[PDB]
Amino acid sequence: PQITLWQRPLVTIKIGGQLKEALLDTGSDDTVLEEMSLPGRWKPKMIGGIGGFIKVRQYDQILIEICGHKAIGTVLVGPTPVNIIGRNLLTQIGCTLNF
Amino acid sequence: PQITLWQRPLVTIKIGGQLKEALLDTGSDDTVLEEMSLPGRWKPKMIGGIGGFIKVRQYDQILIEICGHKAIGTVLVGPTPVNIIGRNLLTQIGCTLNF
Numbered sequence: 443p444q445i446t447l448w449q450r451p452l453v454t455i456k457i458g459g460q461l462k463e464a465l466l467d468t469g470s471d472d473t474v475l476e477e478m479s480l481p482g483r484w485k486p487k488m489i490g491g492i493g494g495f496i497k498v499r500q501y502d503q504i505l506i507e508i509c510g511h512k513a514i515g516t517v518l519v520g521p522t523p524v525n526i527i528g529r530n531l532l533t534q535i536g537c538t539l540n541f
Numbered sequence: 542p543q544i545t546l547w548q549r550p551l552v553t554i555k556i557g558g559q560l561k562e563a564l565l566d567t568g569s570d571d572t573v574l575e576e577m578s579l580p581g582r583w584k585p586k587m588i589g590g591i592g593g594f595i596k597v598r599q600y601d602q603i604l605i606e607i608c609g610h611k612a613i614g615t616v617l618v619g620p621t622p623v624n625i626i627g628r629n630l631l632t633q634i635g636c637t638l639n640f
């Protein structure tokens with residue numbers, strides 16, 4: 443789908459059996475989700491953004507379905523204010539920026 | 542151009558007689574630039590992101606040349622780590638998301 447930027451580019455994701463919504467973000471290297479029920483192991487990590495740094499849990503090899511498209515990758519779970527799909531998964535679904 | 546997401550989508554901008562580089566950010570509603578020499582009147586504002594919030598000065602009606610394209614709009618100047626072009630100018634240059 444061709445997405446215009448007049449509204450926030452929100453998409454529905456299915457992750458770990460749960461449906462959620464997330465923002466398609468080109469300015470984020472990573473995928474960061476609001477706290478949730480995930481399984482398996484995890485590593486602690488820190489990322490930085492606009493108002494500073496947050497502490498997250500890094501989970502590898504997580505399957506995520508984005509707009510009906512499967513992708514497998516690292517997902518960071520922590521105190522983000524909004525679920526963000528970043529560059530690590532955006533490349534997987536062949537997502538491009540066109541002007 | 543058609544921009545792939547394997548690397549950060551960076552572009553060259555021209556603002557205030559100054560050459561800079563900025564990120565195209567679909568997850569930012571606004572445009573936020575590092576601290577600079579900007580002529581005029583401003584208003585304080587608060588914006589927030591991943592790690593928290595920040596204090597910024599809001600400049601309106603600023604001309605920006607974005608990768609050759611001219612746009613006029615609200616520009617926020619403050620303590621960002623990286624220069625960001627968000628959705629308010631992105632729509633002005635016809636930029637879309639595509640998968």
Ligand SMILES: CC(=O)N[C@@H](CC1CCCCC1)[C@@H](O)C[C@H](C(=O)N[C@@H](CCC(N)=O)C(=O)N[C@@H](CCCNC(=N)N)C(N)=O)C(C)C
Nearest residue numbers: 469470490491492524568569570571588589590591622623
């Ligand atoms: C990984 C990350 O951190 N990468 C940043 C971009 C940048 C941060 C610094 C390091 C380089 C990369 C963003 O790509 C993330 C994006 C974000 O930080 N976006 C802001 C900032 C700019 C702006 N001011 O537009 C945003 O849109 N802020 C709105 C609030 C929207 C939240 N929604 C609710 N109302 N609940 C605001 N008015 O402050 C997400 C979390 C939404």
